[PDB]
Write a protein that binds this DNA or RNA. Structure first.
Ligand code: CL
Ligand code: CL
Ligand code: CL
Ligand code: K
Ligand code: MG
Ligand code: MG
Ligand code: MG
Ligand code: MG
Ligand code: MG
Ligand code: MG
Ligand code: MG
Ligand code: MG
Ligand code: MG
Ligand code: MG
Ligand code: MG
Ligand code: MG
Ligand code: MG
Ligand code: MG
Ligand code: MG
Ligand code: MG
Ligand code: MG
Ligand code: MG
Ligand code: MG
Ligand code: MG
Ligand code: MG
Ligand code: MG
Ligand code: MG
Ligand code: MG
Ligand code: MG
Ligand code: MG
Ligand code: MG
Ligand code: MG
Ligand code: MG
Ligand code: MG
Ligand code: MG
Ligand code: MG
Ligand code: MG
Ligand code: MG
Ligand code: MG
Ligand code: MG
Ligand code: MG
Ligand code: MG
Ligand code: MG
Ligand code: MG
Ligand code: MG
Ligand code: MG
Ligand code: MG
Ligand code: MG
Ligand code: MG
Ligand code: MG
Ligand code: NA
Ligand code: NA
Ligand code: NA
Ligand code: NA
Ligand code: NA
Ligand code: NA
Ligand code: NA
Ligand code: NA
Ligand code: NA
Ligand code: NA
Ligand code: NA
Ligand code: NA
Ligand code: NA
Ligand code: NA
Ligand code: NA
Ligand code: NA
Ligand code: NA
Ligand code: NA
Ligand code: NA
Ligand code: NA
Lengths: 73, 56, 237
RNA sequence: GUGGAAGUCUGUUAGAGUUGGUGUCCUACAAUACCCUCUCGUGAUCUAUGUGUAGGGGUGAAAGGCCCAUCGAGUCCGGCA
RNA sequence: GUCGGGUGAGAACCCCGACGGCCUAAUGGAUAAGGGUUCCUCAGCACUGCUGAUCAGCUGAGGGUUAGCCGGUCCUAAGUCAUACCGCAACUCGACUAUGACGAAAUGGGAAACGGGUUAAUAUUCCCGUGCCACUAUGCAGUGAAAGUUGACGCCCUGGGGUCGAUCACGCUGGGCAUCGCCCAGUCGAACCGUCCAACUCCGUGGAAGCCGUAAUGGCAGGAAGCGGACGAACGGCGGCAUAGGGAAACGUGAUUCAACCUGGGGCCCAUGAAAAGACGAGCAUAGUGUCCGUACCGAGAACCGACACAGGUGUCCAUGGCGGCGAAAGCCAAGGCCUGUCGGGAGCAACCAACGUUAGGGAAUUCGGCAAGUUAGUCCCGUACCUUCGGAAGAAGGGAUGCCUGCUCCGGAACGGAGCAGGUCGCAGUGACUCGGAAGCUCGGACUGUCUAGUAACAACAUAGGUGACCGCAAAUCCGCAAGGACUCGUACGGUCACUGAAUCCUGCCCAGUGCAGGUAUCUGAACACCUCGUACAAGAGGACGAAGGACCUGUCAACGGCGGGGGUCUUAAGGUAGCGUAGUACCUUGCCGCAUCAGUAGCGGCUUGCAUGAAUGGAUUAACCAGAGCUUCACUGUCCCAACGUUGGGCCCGGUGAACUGUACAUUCCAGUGCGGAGUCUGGAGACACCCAGGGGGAAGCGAAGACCCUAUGGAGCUUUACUGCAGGCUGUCGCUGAGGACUCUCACUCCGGGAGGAGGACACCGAUAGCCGGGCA
RNA sequence: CGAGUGGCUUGCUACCUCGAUGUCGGUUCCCUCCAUCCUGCCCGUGCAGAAGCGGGCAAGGGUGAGGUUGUUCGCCUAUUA
RNA sequence: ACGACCGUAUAGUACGAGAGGAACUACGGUUGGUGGCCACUGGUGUACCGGUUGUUCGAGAGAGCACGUGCCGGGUAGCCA
């Protein structure tokens, strides 16, 4: 997490970096299969180590509140 | 760094060279333009009235 | 005095240009004779250096291979379609007329066939509200209600990469790296920190603007600085 | 325990910089030098070569700094006795 | 450097030998740029060389650079040019769009060369031997042939394969040493041809429900391990090359750690890390062809730039020579280079000066200030406060240990790797030199890393993330251009432009009167054209009607410019200073008052505080971490001081040689007084005064150096400012032309934009040309 | 209230220097003045003594060390004839 | 080229109700200044002797370098306070 930042930058900045990256690094459920093997490959790029499925998602989350709405309507 | 003597050491770049058209060492090999005769810029020869006194 | 920075910009010198030669593709909707039969398969997902957002590589039936402005939720293997009869699923592109009202859309054309102009940045989207035989009313990400020819093509879904703005840059160096990929001069020296000769706010024994910051719309370049034709300022009220 | 992040630390590694000595020098080795001390040294890093921007114009993390020992408007010749 | 010697008319510095030294990322080896013959030989010394010279980068004359397989050449990069088109009064000018070309010699991509030998000077070029590539021709094979692969790629961490080197063991060859038995060198052998293949990927078998595997992550019934197989690496192994070559000889074998080279795994991105030619895909024999340009040398304390043989400046590769140790560190030493960072000789060599060592007792008393110097120091163990954003503070502080010798234990496959144990033992001192932090506290500022006044300022200034406001739906906002056109933009509000503030934390009050911006506007004001009236056989001209933007007027707006008092228990002019902070880097009075601390404290810190003249993004308060930033206190330390001494090295002094400059109206041995335009070696009166020369520290010559920067003056200059004067761009708005049909409206045909086209949108508007009004330090 | 002396302060003047007479404070090193702080020799005393106060002659010698402040000045401390 | 102070005897005396408390003179010492000197103490002493770290000369012996002594310990003459 933000431990790499030492005593620099202040609370807010590193609290949010840790929070965002924490969720970014969590196991993610692949949309193709259902396995929890989705990792970020870069900005907005996600991929399943299991089946190889490579797809677009949020910048730090594979799914965003807006993307979820699309499915519905 | 001193702008004088110490800055004179990096000057090993070739720019003005012997010109094919006029023979002067004014053909800028980077610009491919002679600063003396205009070769590379003008078919006509470079020349100006201010190169001599006004009434001469 | 001297020309102000905003004036140096227009000359288009290296310092102010975008590193175009380093960009990948000019994202635009494909041209279809008609019929809509045009479909392709997503072959890969790449990073777009000009938008800090993902983009999708697609192989179309008629052999054409082009990068596409990727909405969220598109992956390798998916089949996208472009045309009047395109199915109504994310990643497909069709005229606002064939799109069901109430659906989120991106890369909307301003004029039919221009290839897409609105809602293209990370995570944004337009909202098709009203239909008609003459006008298609769309709500852009800025919140504005835009009247568009229903013939204007668009892509179903919200643009990929949403949430990019949620993370702080934290350090100067990170901004630096991003700025290097844009047509922008950075960092930014405050006008009030300059000399009178260099900026209308320059000069003085201490730092403060000389006059009020709200400048008229009619001000000439070199003088139009600060709060341009501000209808109001501050937060109060 | 593993792992090995960082505009992270120490560091005359290379390399970059230039705080104090208001030392030596000050018809100099030098029209900006010498020595000791000192700062940075995985990054907004340093650097070679190529390349672009030109004078009321550039360039400027802004000191009116820099644009060939020339800058609150370069240099050359001319206007000009 | 010294002693001998060589050559020569002449020798401190030209050459030989010995002895003694210097350089170790360089003072060695290879090179880029740049220089341009400086390279080699012979002959010379008038020039150049910090002295001399027989020497030379000097002078003169000759000579010297050899390529199918090293570079160029070819490709394309940022980008540049040419032609066409268009603009411009015009062009040697100018943006776009086409086309074409140019654009990389160390250091992008790339068909092919190795070994030995040779010259005074070249050398993957010549010679000998061997190998290889491309094209073409002939012949056999082949119908395949263009899909694909390659060229071709970021940053961080890491495994495996593996050569050189280095080291260890043992043997052989040669050398050194001479109480031992040690120590040094060598022990060789290419391109290329052939062959082998780890890793990755995949196939078959197998059938794991918990196993498989890693340095780490990881893998699997969507099929784990095991087993078998396909594809598949090195500049690597192996065989050939090679009764080639090289060596006086021997002409080794194993090992460890392993640069190069090869091949994998992991991690990061609001950052995504070239392109093209070319190669592969796509066989073999024989033969022919392979032109053109470069090639010497230096590459620097003498061959480059800096006027110089200049202590400056100047890119790449050798980063694996030994000991040492964490080390590409120090110190010492090889290989290789040098004694040319090129003037010498003499004096115990004084004064004085530059660098520097050591100084008893005291220990910052020195000083603006601890400036300068000193102290500490490596590693291991123990132990570690306030505060804190929980990361840090921290190597806090403080305490202990540290060598050698003998025999061992543990980790590991092992190291010539690491961690320990027992015993013995020497010194004042065991990180024994070298290398190598002094520590603690209070306050101020800026959050932090970063930036800056090349050449007196490195800071608190700039930047920054973060906070905020403004403009804009893209035929946009902003900006460049005279125009043709252009940047932003391969971009599209999670954007990007224009500004302010400047991490975090707690917060950010009141004021819209003035000024600015913006919206509205009955009425008022408001230009020109057209229109109406008067005037003129026409015209000038006077007047009217209509009225755009703008203004009056109204409203919104301060994280817009800015403001937040006097008086009384409201007045100017809108409000009348809230949280906070406060004698401040802001406090005149001022060394404010009280306290801390000291013998004594205009300092510093804390409290008070009526604040000459604090205060909220002109940001207020506060703040961990950071700092060559400003002030203060303590311990430690010490020649900063009391108060100076002695010593070391280079000068200074004498001698040989070389050999300037500054400065000079004249005269001049002055001193004390006086006088004088009031600051005299020179006038006046006295006094003193034999001449010349050496060394010294600088009292005077208002010493030398510079037509004073301060100040004023000039109907001098320049940069900058603005509600100075006058104008000029630019923006807004009316009108006319382009411009057409039927105070509000439709249409389509010009014109504009979107579309490949069909066609769609818009439309007499817009654009453009002309003009009128308003704004207009953006500019003159 | 009246008369003066000095040329250390301050003010005035604008004589001298604007083709430059280098600033304040400090320091170091030399000479001097007396309107004498100490020391010598004296006079008066509201001089018992001791300790003082005031005055005269007198410039031989001495007049030191520190804390705040750039300070001169001045405030403060302990020594001192 | 000497200035000045403290102490002892004078004396617990003269003076004085007491408290307190002198002097002449003779002595001893200190301080500041001055000139010279080195037996004594102290400093230096890169003369010298020893110890010892790293490295090189194979070890030993004996040596070079480590800034003009590698460092540490002792230190004669001389010069000095
Ligand atoms: Cl951004
Ligand atoms: Cl070459
Ligand atoms: Cl691995
Ligand atoms: K003057
Ligand atoms: Mg310059
Ligand atoms: Mg594009
Ligand atoms: Mg840029
Ligand atoms: Mg800024
Ligand atoms: Mg400034
Ligand atoms: Mg201005
Ligand atoms: Mg400010
Ligand atoms: Mg401000
Ligand atoms: Mg760092
Ligand atoms: Mg460092
Ligand atoms: Mg460059
Ligand atoms: Mg300034
Ligand atoms: Mg020669
Ligand atoms: Mg000769
Ligand atoms: Mg080319
Ligand atoms: Mg190349
Ligand atoms: Mg040669
Ligand atoms: Mg050569
Ligand atoms: Mg030389
Ligand atoms: Mg001492
Ligand atoms: Mg003091
Ligand atoms: Mg003092
Ligand atoms: Mg210091
Ligand atoms: Mg073991
Ligand atoms: Mg030590
Ligand atoms: Mg203060
Ligand atoms: Mg800072
Ligand atoms: Mg400077
Ligand atoms: Mg600094
Ligand atoms: Mg400086
Ligand atoms: Mg700042
Ligand atoms: Mg900001
Ligand atoms: Mg932001
Ligand atoms: Mg912002
Ligand atoms: Mg106070
Ligand atoms: Mg406010
Ligand atoms: Mg006379
Ligand atoms: Mg003058
Ligand atoms: Mg002035
Ligand atoms: Mg002027
Ligand atoms: Mg168009
Ligand atoms: Mg002006
Ligand atoms: Mg003078
Ligand atoms: Mg008298
Ligand atoms: Mg006297
Ligand atoms: Mg020595
Ligand atoms: Na200003
Ligand atoms: Na852990
Ligand atoms: Na320096
Ligand atoms: Na100019
Ligand atoms: Na002239
Ligand atoms: Na010589
Ligand atoms: Na091989
Ligand atoms: Na080593
Ligand atoms: Na740093
Ligand atoms: Na107002
Ligand atoms: Na207002
Ligand atoms: Na205020
Ligand atoms: Na810094
Ligand atoms: Na000393
Ligand atoms: Na003198
Ligand atoms: Na000026
Ligand atoms: Na004068
Ligand atoms: Na002075
Ligand atoms: Na006296
Ligand atoms: Na004082």
């Amino acid at each position: 997490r933000s431990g790499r930042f030492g005593a620099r930058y202040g609370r807010v900045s590193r609290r949010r970096v840790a929070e965002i990256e924490s969720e970014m690094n969590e196991d993610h459920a692949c949309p193709n299969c259902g396995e929890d093997r989705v990792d970020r490959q870069g900005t907005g790029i996600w991929q399943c180590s299991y089946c190889d499925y490579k797809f677009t998602g949020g910048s730090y989350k594979p799914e965003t509140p807006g993307g979820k709405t699309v499915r519905r309507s | 760094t001193g702008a004088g003597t110490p800055s004179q050491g990096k000057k090993n770049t070739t720019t003005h060279t012997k010109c094919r058209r006029c023979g002067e060492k004014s053909y800028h090999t980077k610009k491919k333009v002679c600063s003396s005769c205009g070769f590379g810029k003008s078919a006509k020869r470079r020349d100006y009235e201010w190169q001599s006194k006004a009434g001469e | 005095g001297r020309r102000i920075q905003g004036q140096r910009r227009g000359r288009g010198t290296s310092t102010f240009r975008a590193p175009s030669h380093r960009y990948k593709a000019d994202l635009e909707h494909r041209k279809v004779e008609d019929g809509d039969v045009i479909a392709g398969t997503v072959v890969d997902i790449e990073h777009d250096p000009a938008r800090s957002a993902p983009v999708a590589a697609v192989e179309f039936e008629d052999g054409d291979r082009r990068l596409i402005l990727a909405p969220e939720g598109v992956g390798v293997g998916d089949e996208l379609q472009v045309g009047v009869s395109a199915e109504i699923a994310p990643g497909n592109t069709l005229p606002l007329a064939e799109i069901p009202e109430g659906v989120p859309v991106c890369n909307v054309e301003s004029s039919p066939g221009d290839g897409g102009k609105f809602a293209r940045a990370s995570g944004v989207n337009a909202q098709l509200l009203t239909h008609d035989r003459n006008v298609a009313v769309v709500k852009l990400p800025s919140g504005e209600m835009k009247r568009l020819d229903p013939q204007c093509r668009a892509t179903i879904g919200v643009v990929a990469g949403g949430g990019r703005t949620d993370k702080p840059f934290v350090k100067a160096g990170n901004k630096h790296h991003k700025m290097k990929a844009r047509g922008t001069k950075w960092p930014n020296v405050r006008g009030v920190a300059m000399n009178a000769v260099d900026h209308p706010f320059g000069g003085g024994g201490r730092q403060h603007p000389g006059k009020p910051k709200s400048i008229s719309r009619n001000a000439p370049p070199g003088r139009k600085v600060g709060d341009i034709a501000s209808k109001r300022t501050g937060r109060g009220g």
